[PDB]
Assembly symmetry: D2
Homo-oligomer: 249 residues x 4
Amino acid sequence: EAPAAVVTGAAKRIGRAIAVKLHQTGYRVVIHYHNSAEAAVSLADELNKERSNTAVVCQADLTNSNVLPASCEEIINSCFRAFGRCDVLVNNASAFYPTPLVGKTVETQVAELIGTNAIAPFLLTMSFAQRQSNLSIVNLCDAMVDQPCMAFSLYNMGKHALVGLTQSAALELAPYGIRVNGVAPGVSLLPVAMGEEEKDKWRRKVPLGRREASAEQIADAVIFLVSGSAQYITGSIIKVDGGLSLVHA
Amino acid sequence: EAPAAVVTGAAKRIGRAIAVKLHQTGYRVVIHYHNSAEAAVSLADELNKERSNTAVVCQADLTNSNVLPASCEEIINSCFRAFGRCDVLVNNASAFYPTPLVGKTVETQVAELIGTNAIAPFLLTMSFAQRQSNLSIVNLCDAMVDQPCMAFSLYNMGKHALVGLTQSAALELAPYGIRVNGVAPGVSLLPVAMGEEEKDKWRRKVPLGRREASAEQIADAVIFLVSGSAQYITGSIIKVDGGLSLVHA
Amino acid sequence: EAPAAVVTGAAKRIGRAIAVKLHQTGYRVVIHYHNSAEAAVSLADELNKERSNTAVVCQADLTNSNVLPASCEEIINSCFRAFGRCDVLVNNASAFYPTPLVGKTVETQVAELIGTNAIAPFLLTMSFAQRQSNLSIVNLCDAMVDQPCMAFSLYNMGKHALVGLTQSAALELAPYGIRVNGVAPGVSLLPVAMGEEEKDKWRRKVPLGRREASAEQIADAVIFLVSGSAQYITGSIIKVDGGLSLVHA
Amino acid sequence: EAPAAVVTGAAKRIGRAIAVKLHQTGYRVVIHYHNSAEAAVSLADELNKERSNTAVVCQADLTNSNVLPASCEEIINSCFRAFGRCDVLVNNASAFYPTPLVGKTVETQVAELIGTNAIAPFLLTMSFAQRQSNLSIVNLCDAMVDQPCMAFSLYNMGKHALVGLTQSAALELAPYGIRVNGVAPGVSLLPVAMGEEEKDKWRRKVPLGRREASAEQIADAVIFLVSGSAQYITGSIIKVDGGLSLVHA
Ligand SMILES: NC(=O)c1ccc[n+]([C@@H]2O[C@H](COP(=O)([O-])OP(=O)(O)OC[C@H]3O[C@@H](n4cnc5c(N)ncnc54)[C@H](OP(=O)(O)O)[C@@H]3O)[C@@H](O)[C@H]2O)c1
Ligand SMILES: NC(=O)c1ccc[n+]([C@@H]2O[C@H](COP(=O)([O-])OP(=O)(O)OC[C@H]3O[C@@H](n4cnc5c(N)ncnc54)[C@H](OP(=O)(O)O)[C@@H]3O)[C@@H](O)[C@H]2O)c1
Ligand SMILES: NC(=O)c1ccc[n+]([C@@H]2O[C@H](COP(=O)([O-])OP(=O)(O)OC[C@H]3O[C@@H](n4cnc5c(N)ncnc54)[C@H](OP(=O)(O)O)[C@@H]3O)[C@@H](O)[C@H]2O)c1
Ligand SMILES: NC(=O)c1ccc[n+]([C@@H]2O[C@H](COP(=O)([O-])OP(=O)(O)OC[C@H]3O[C@@H](n4cnc5c(N)ncnc54)[C@H](OP(=O)(O)O)[C@@H]3O)[C@@H](O)[C@H]2O)c1
Ligand SMILES: Nc1nc2[nH]c(-c3ccccc3)c(-c3ccccc3)c2c(=O)[nH]1
Ligand SMILES: Nc1nc2[nH]c(-c3ccccc3)c(-c3ccccc3)c2c(=O)[nH]1
Ligand SMILES: Nc1nc2[nH]c(-c3ccccc3)c(-c3ccccc3)c2c(=O)[nH]1
Ligand SMILES: Nc1nc2[nH]c(-c3ccccc3)c(-c3ccccc3)c2c(=O)[nH]1
């Protein structure tokens, strides 16, 4: 039987690209989404058109709350129900918006930014491990985590927590043969709420080609880490940033 | 007149030593505490006996919840109520216990470990900044954050988030002349819950002196960072670890 | 036309595995060596018997001296002379022995350790760049660089410098399309006549499998980095260490 | 009896400020210099006036060569000959100039940049240890080491090696009671060769006050690390950068 993967926030953009590349590599996939239902089902349709019974969807909010653990357990369970196994978890889904220190309440900002970027990854990691082969987890980190965006403190705190999870879970799950790694983009697919002049501002900062990464380039590094060529790699975070993090102010 | 400082979890151990040193340097202090009411009240009394009405107690659970923002605003408020100003915030309070990936619920563990180590610090930081010469914040970090204790994922995640806050907040509050730094103990005062064979193992690991740091040694770095000798220092985390973090497995 | 690579210290152990693996992917290779002449020529023979005119040797001492720049230029020249091009440079040669702070002179220890691990890589990088598709350089780093072996200060200095080269050259050569990355082993092929006690100690410290990396596992990360699957990756160092670097003392 | 310190490159700028602050703190000082002979004797004169026989000069080139170890030995010996003891070594002297990868020879560039920033510090550290209370060494590092200046690869390699030396020497000298730490400026005293256009560009990048650090501000951090308030601190590098290293491109 083919191995199976859960990719969170996989309806669009980088997660979709990762689910496609995993599917093309031979994986069956759980396409987790929150609001992008049409895009999710549309993607599952297409992957199933290529290989029947190889893709399902799973809806969940990954905001922190007292039921997040049950939601994360259900995501992993949905993979076992569909495919009878769960070999790969990709923690991709991410809330991203400014939260200045000086519409949403602060309680909600905390719950969304810390829940999606860190706590859900942790609970998903727990459920993945408890439900248990080249088993691995890839976390989508941030190459700029030590040179953060102005006024993105909660988002940055989440991404730093995710580095911590990557390290602590690599350490703890190693005896079980589960590898835990990260992929850290710089600028890749640019936010939709961003004008051309802003996009060119960011592009111009990247030493290697003065362009953003394609979603597929981020996916390539994911594919490497889950592959048999990375069987001794755990606790490593691969930057896929074109040198951006190397550039001083 | 004299500056004022909030120290969280200041009733005992390291937070106490920090509150005392700040007080001996001339600060008025808010002694925050959670359960240790006798030790807290007793400490404010000892300090007030030295200098009249230079200390107040303030109780608050710093576990994450929908009331945590109000709680943190009230801690900062209590410093302004008592002293008319708030020059220094020290984020010291911390829950610390194992949370294995494989009698508290996971959601309580998340709330306590991430709340105390990261979320409360962010909220205090926000409140501190909104209420605003040498203003500064000192976050109690962890020298071993990249070599974490087995099965302490949530704690480590919290301490990573706290690095992120330290960096993000230094960047964002610099324009208001608020510095934000960290002090990172290795092993200092050893926990009550730890075994003797484990206690001595830790001491022998320390290159410098094969002993743990005193609470006072930790405090000395806090005093340096809040002083006028640290006026251009922001976004820095000083390890006070006797070389422990340099030691391989 | 097949791409060509220079691998330094390619006669044995990890460098040999890298040469073999690049040759298997379709590269012609220059096998650089210092003293292991028989192994180097035996490797070249084997690779040429596999595909004709795809392997040569180049001998050079990579000790720091006033002739080092010419030696490094000669190494890069030898690829162009045999193959007409040079697409990949792998900086793998390394002196490794203790240099306590308290038979070789210190002058020689500095020359050997800093020369092989840092300055030769830098000179080689300069010669490679100046002579210029998918061009890259991979530097063999050290996952334990921040938790060094006791009394190995010059070696550790060399490997830190090599990080700095990796970053600095990534930044400077990105406009030319030359990527510069690192692979950082923990414990791999265990040095000859290490005791069974010692080896076993090291193995038992590795979280993932309690075993050292095979030279091939180190080579797999090199191959990935040179590949078209790493096209946006520059200035990244990938640890291949089984989680060794995550393990506290 | 007054303790004694060696400060390399102390005739001018930051090393001067450090020697001055050490002397004001009670130390006798060896003012090492290379070309700035008049500045150096002018400083020893100014200090000796305040306190008789408490300052001497010592001329030495700290370029790498086969006699560099003798030169570093003699610097240390100059402290013993003048003061009977040597308690503090500050590695401040530094060559700084671009060395592009694509009229000094490269040999000379390597010797000057690696010698002054790394090898001389190693050899000075060796001699300090071997020639032997509150003994310590402070290395002047660089807060921007992971975000290098374009075309400054050799300078950057040397500063990375100096991080490595700080860590390795901290580990190895801990048992002997010698602490080893760093201070990492961002932008401080602006080079004399620079024009007020370019100076302002640098100043504008600094979040904490849009200004370079003062030499005294750097010196303040050195004084803290040599003091009894840093007695458990070893292997720590304190950034004094005004948040500059936290600012993305
Ligand atoms: N794009 C970049 O340049 C960049 C840079 C650095 C790091 N990264 C990281 O790479 C990963 C992918 O980036 P991206 O730009 O593709 O991400 P994105 O479009 O910003 O987010 C991916 C998905 O996250 C899901 N999500 C958001 N909030 C959620 C919630 N409360 N509960 C459940 N799911 C939620 C959304 O699902 P629905 O659409 O279904 O609602 C969204 O499609 C992220 O972790 C990101 O942080 C990206
Ligand atoms: N000890 C070490 O060697 C070491 C090593 C690494 C890092 N650190 C860090 O340095 C700081 C001080 O260390 P420590 O050993 O002194 O800390 P600790 O004794 O373990 O905790 C200090 C205080 O935190 C408060 N706290 C715990 N949970 C709380 C909650 N839910 N709400 C509010 N307050 C809470 C407690 O207050 P009450 O007693 O009033 O309930 C406690 O006295 C901590 O941030 C710690 O993470 C210490
Ligand atoms: N093995 C591990 O566990 C490990 C751990 C961390 C990092 N690494 C890094 O990974 C790389 C490969 O490791 P390894 O164990 O295979 O290395 P190695 O066998 O110790 O040395 C590789 C080669 O370096 C060459 N060399 C040594 N001194 C030289 C000199 N003065 N001039 C020219 N070449 C010289 C030697 O060539 P000849 O044999 O031809 O004389 C030797 O075969 C190294 O850069 C190492 O530092 C390895
Ligand atoms: N200034 C900054 O903004 C900044 C930024 C980052 C790091 N740092 C570090 O902080 C330290 C001080 O900075 P700075 O600007 O004061 O340094 P600097 O003025 O550039 O150099 C200090 C001294 O180094 C000595 N030196 C240069 N080449 C030498 C050689 N071949 N042999 C012996 N000595 C030599 C010189 O002595 P003579 O004049 O006597 O010849 C010089 O006065 C340096 O280590 C620097 O890298 C400074
Ligand atoms: N979930 C999510 N996370 C993101 N992080 C970044 C980002 C953060 C710091 C530095 C650069 C990019 C981005 C980002 C992507 C392109 C340009 C700017 C920011 C991003 C995003 O679009 N979605
Ligand atoms: N709040 C709180 N945080 C702590 N962190 C540590 C610690 C964590 C990682 C490595 C070493 C010490 C400790 C700790 C203290 C002594 C020995 C081991 C761990 C500690 C603590 O007692 N209280
Ligand atoms: N050239 C060269 N470099 C090496 N570095 C290491 C090493 C260094 C620090 C931590 C672990 C391994 C090693 C090393 C390899 C196995 C066990 C211990 C050290 C090594 C080597 O054999 N050759
Ligand atoms: N010896 C020596 N080292 C230096 N390093 C820097 C520096 C390096 C990287 C980033 C910022 C400053 C500088 C420097 C100082 C001010 C402006 C730009 C660079 C500097 C210097 O003047 N002398």
